[PDB]
Amino acid sequence: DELYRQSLEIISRYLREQATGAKDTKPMGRSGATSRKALETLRRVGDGVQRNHETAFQGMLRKLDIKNEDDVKSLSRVMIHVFSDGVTNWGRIVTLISFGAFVAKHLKTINQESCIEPLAESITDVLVRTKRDWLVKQRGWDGFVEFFHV
Numbered sequence: 001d002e003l004y005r006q007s008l009e010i011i012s013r014y015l016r017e018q019a020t021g022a023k024d025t026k027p028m029g030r031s032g033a034t035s036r037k038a039l040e041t042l043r044r045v046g047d048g049v050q051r052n053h054e055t056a057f058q059g060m061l062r063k064l065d066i067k068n069e070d071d072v073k074s075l076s077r078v079m080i081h082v083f084s085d086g087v088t089n090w091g092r093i094v095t096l097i098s099f100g101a102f103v104a105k106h107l108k109t110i111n112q113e114s115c116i117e118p119l120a121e122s123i124t125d126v127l128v129r130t131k132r133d134w135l136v137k138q139r140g141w142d143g144f145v146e147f148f149h150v
């Protein structure tokens with residue numbers, strides 16, 4: 001499964017970049033072109049979604065009661081509940097990743113930067129295993145970037 005690897009890489013780099021603030025060096029593996037502008041798409045749109053959804057994001061974060069990695073292994077079930085209810089679109093998916101970034105910035109504050117990698121993997125696993133076929137019909141991240149062009 002490569003869609004898992006491509007998605008995980010995009011989600012990881014965006015979350016860590018949000019958490020840290022550095023636009024990261026390093027090679028963007030393979031198929032980097034689509035992944036590069038989805039990440040660039042996430043920079044432009046995802047952070048604004050966080051601004052537009054700040055109240056419930058702060059509320060959700062306060063109720064989740066995140067402290068360590070053993071909390072992360074329980075966030076998936078709440079993620080699966082809030083996310084999988086309804087019909088699929090890219091707005092839901094960019095919202096999913098946006099709150100992951102919100103959680104990532106919080107995790108750094110409480111000095112829990114090592115937990116950003118499970119989160120992104122939990123996010124990635126929740127997305128593909130529930131939206132795989134749809135992501136294939138939408139041509140994956142190509143249809144993502146095509147959707148969010150400016």
Ligand SMILES: Cc1cc(OCCCc2c3n(c4c(-c5c(C)nn(C)c5C)cccc24)CCCN(Cc2cccc(C(=O)O)c2)C3=O)cc(C)c1Cl
Pocket residue numbers: 053056057060064075076078079080082083091092095096097099100101103123
């Ligand atoms: C990383 C992580 C992520 C998690 O979940 C990510 C799911 C994304 C998400 C959604 N919602 C969220 C809320 C929220 C709000 C807003 N109000 N209330 C009451 C709540 C609960 C708070 C947080 C996240 C979400 C509510 C409605 C917005 N949609 C559907 C939708 C449909 C159509 C158009 C749009 C559009 O805006 O374009 C959006 C969501 O799927 C969970 C965990 C545990 C973790 Cl650790």
